[PDB]
Amino acid sequence: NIITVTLNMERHHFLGISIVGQSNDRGDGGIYIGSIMKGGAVAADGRIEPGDMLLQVNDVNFENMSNDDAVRVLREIVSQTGPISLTVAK
Numbered sequence: 001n002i003i004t005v006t007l008n009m010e011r012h013h014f015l016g017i018s019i020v021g022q023s024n025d026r027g028d029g030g031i032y033i034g035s036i037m038k039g040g041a042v043a044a045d046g047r048i049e050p051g052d053m054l055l056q057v058n059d060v061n062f063e064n065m066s067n068d069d070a071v072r073v074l075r076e077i078v079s080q081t082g083p084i085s086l087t088v089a090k
């Protein structure tokens with residue numbers, strides 16, 4: 001079940017979701033949500049929970065990107081201004 005959530009970065013300063021990259025023999029393990037930090041934008045939503053997979057983040061797609069690279073691009077968005085839309089795979 002793919003769900004897209006729009007986090008408000010006006011009142012929230014951090015998302016509160018530690019990204020965990022899944023590493024294996026191949027490498028396309030993808031990035032998943034580790035833990036949610038109370039006080040973050042994600043904790044204000046509720047649809048995202050530990051174990052959710054990040055697919056698309058503000059138009060950008062991480063499904064065919066490296067785990068590390070996904071976080072690289074993600075950091076550019078997370079350290080920017082504007083609404084952050086997270087597309088998770090539950």
Ligand SMILES: CC1=C(CC(=O)O)c2cc(F)ccc2/C1=C\c1ccc([S@@](C)=O)cc1
Nearest residue numbers: 014015016017018019020040071074075078
């Ligand atoms: C909690 C958390 C957030 C969201 C937030 O709380 O605002 C986040 C955003 C990013 F763009 C990158 C990393 C993180 C993070 C925890 C963590 C995950 C991976 C790394 S390594 C893969 O660089 C380090 C730390």
